[PDB]
Amino acid sequence: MDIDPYKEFGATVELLSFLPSDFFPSVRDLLDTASALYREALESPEHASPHHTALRQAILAWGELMTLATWVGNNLEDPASRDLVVNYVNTNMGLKIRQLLWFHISALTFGRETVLEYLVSFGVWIRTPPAYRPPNAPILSTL
Amino acid sequence: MDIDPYKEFGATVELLSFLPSDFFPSVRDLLDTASALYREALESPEHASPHHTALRQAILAWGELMTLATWVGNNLEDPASRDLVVNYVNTNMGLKIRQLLWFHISALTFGRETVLEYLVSFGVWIRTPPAYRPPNAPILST
Amino acid sequence: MDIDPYKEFGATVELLSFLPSDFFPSVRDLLDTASALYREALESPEHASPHHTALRQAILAWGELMTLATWVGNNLEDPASRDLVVNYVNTNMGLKIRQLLWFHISALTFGRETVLEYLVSFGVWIRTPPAYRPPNAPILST
Amino acid sequence: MDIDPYKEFGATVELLSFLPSDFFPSVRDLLDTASALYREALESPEHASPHHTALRQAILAWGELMTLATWVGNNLEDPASRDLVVNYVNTNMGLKIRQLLWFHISALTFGRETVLEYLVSFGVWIRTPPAYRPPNAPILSTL
Amino acid sequence: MDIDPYKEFGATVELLSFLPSDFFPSVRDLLDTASALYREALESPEHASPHHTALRQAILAWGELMTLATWVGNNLEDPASRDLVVNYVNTNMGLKIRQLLWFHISALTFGRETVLEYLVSFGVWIRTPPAYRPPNAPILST
Amino acid sequence: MDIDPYKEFGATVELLSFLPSDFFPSVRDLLDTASALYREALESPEHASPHHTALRQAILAWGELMTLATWVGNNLEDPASRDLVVNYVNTNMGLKIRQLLWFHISALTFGRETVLEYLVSFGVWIRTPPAYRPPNAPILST
């Protein structure tokens, strides 16, 4: 249905159908980051923060969809459909899973408040047109 | 990569490669009852329990992949391709999504511990041969 | 030689020559659910309960005799011999191993006392003739 | 599966896929020892130590496999298969059941700590080659 | 069997097979820095801090490998096997020992926590795109 | 540069290139004992005692060398260079890693001082002639 997912974390999709697309790093890189940083933290029987839980389910999903891409590569003969589907996956679903993942890693590493404020500052940066923005966009100061 | 998805819920995927596949319901009725029961708790700005949060993320992914199937059927030409893809969606990954949903929903409306006991009891039910089987497997109620 | 195997579990082999043979499940699903439920407690350096310990030793013997059957099928020539042996394994001694497993596993997930009550209730169920029998024998849940 | 059985008693299979084969006494002798020493101790409704319990289940198993050997003797016509199976039983399964049994009797009689330390000392003895080992290998001093 | 040489220093091989390999500089510079900066501490027979001790054993092992390469060059004249050997050495063991030396030296000089948070920050930097990364990458502070 | 990996544990390579090499047994038995006896401590991410840590790094290095031998056997077909390589490995690095593993394991199990005085006693034993040595050589006591 029409649920707002981040509503319990203060954000909203309109606050993140707002950023550009290139900002979020590549998906493989997100997964490697999350795993290498929080391997034993995520494998543990503890819901120490819900960020971990949503992150965990999202990673399950992305594993399932990489399985989808591989499987479709294994069986579908129509090459246009194969290429089109794989591109749609890695592009649009890619964008959404990147939103989700990057958000949760950021909340973990720097705190939900810091990311919330960073997004507001980025928004004020990007609503501004080229003629008056700074050359560089803001950055996550952890304190 | 090495994720144990259900580790923070006192359960394990070993314990759900342990039910069968066909037991789980359709996604449609399941999603509908989830909505009708927890509209507010899902829309709220509150992490009332982690169950709600994992559920939110699952609904996101499911809606996005419904949009995927629809977009794919909007553009491709090979109908065999479209049918095969939308089967892989509604059948194979659907099993995963249904596992995840059914677990979290039942845990919400009943509790974690009751679900664990139910899974163990279904284990005792299904490992049993047919002849001395009960007539009706358990249907959980609070 | 005169061992009463289940004497330290408030039960007796008389009370399990009292169920039938066919009630017990396959070794495969049973072992699988055991693993999926008690991976850690079996791997741990802890005798959390004697049930775990007897279970460990049973899994050892079962794995070793699977290796036995495989080795025997690796070398012999007479296929009648191989089939007869691997039947004696998966059928006759399998019954013993399944008794032992099912008892300890069910006692783990539920408790000793619940298992005792279940056995007595199955006794009352099966000694009863078919006509006034219940439709479904008991399926234990916590 | 890949369980480590002795992990709750401090040992490990690598610590006992380490000894030689001749060391463990004959199986019939193990059973006679265990029975004559702890007949009423094992028949009792007491799990006074888990050693007793694992010992009890192991003896059940060996009874079942002696029944296997006898039964195969009763029915199998192919003599090579009969001899081969009986030898495999009394040899490899023999070795493993001897490991288990001797361990548990030792833990009972002398305490798990003493056997643990004895195994370490035996290991230090046997890793040493012939040129520098003592002529005799160590022995279970109960104190 | 499950030997992870970073388990007790707050990390794992995955966290170090997370950066690109090219960041970890060539072994010669590492050894030179180690010697020039801790001649005394590595010559000292005191188990001051375990980082030093791992570093000791690591340097001994690398010296052993260089001795091996020497023995090969001075005894095996054949070029194909020799070259493949030296490539395997300077590539795979090169990678591992570079990782190890960099981590331990950095932890000694600066500190454990600082190295870990540096890895995390460098990760999220290099994964992050160029148009919105910080202008200059992070770097270790005394 | 003057790297002596025993400097902080009360010894030196000379004191271990003092016994005959044949006393230090083959690597397989060492690794098996280490695993079977300290699976947990070597899997634990805690710098409990530096002996453990040196042992960790040493096992990683030996595994790396075995991986090297594997890579050579799976890529270099020439037998002369390959055989000379494996001989150098299983001889020289074999010696050093045997020395190291024996010392550290023994020190863990029994204690530092006991290993040192054992070396001293074994030395003065084997150097001493047969007609007036003790009847049986010394041996480590718990």
Automatic annotation (TrEMBL), chains B, C, E, F:
<dbReference type="InterPro" id="IPR002006">
    <property type="entry name" value="Hepatitis_core"/>
</dbReference>
<dbReference type="InterPro" id="IPR036459">
    <property type="entry name" value="Viral_capsid_core_dom_sf_HBV"/>
</dbReference>
<dbReference type="GO" id="GO:0005198">
    <property type="term" value="F:structural molecule activity"/>
</dbReference>
<dbReference type="Pfam" id="PF00906">
    <property type="entry name" value="Hepatitis_core"/>
</dbReference>
<protein>
    <submittedName>
        <fullName>Core protein</fullName>
    </submittedName>
</protein>
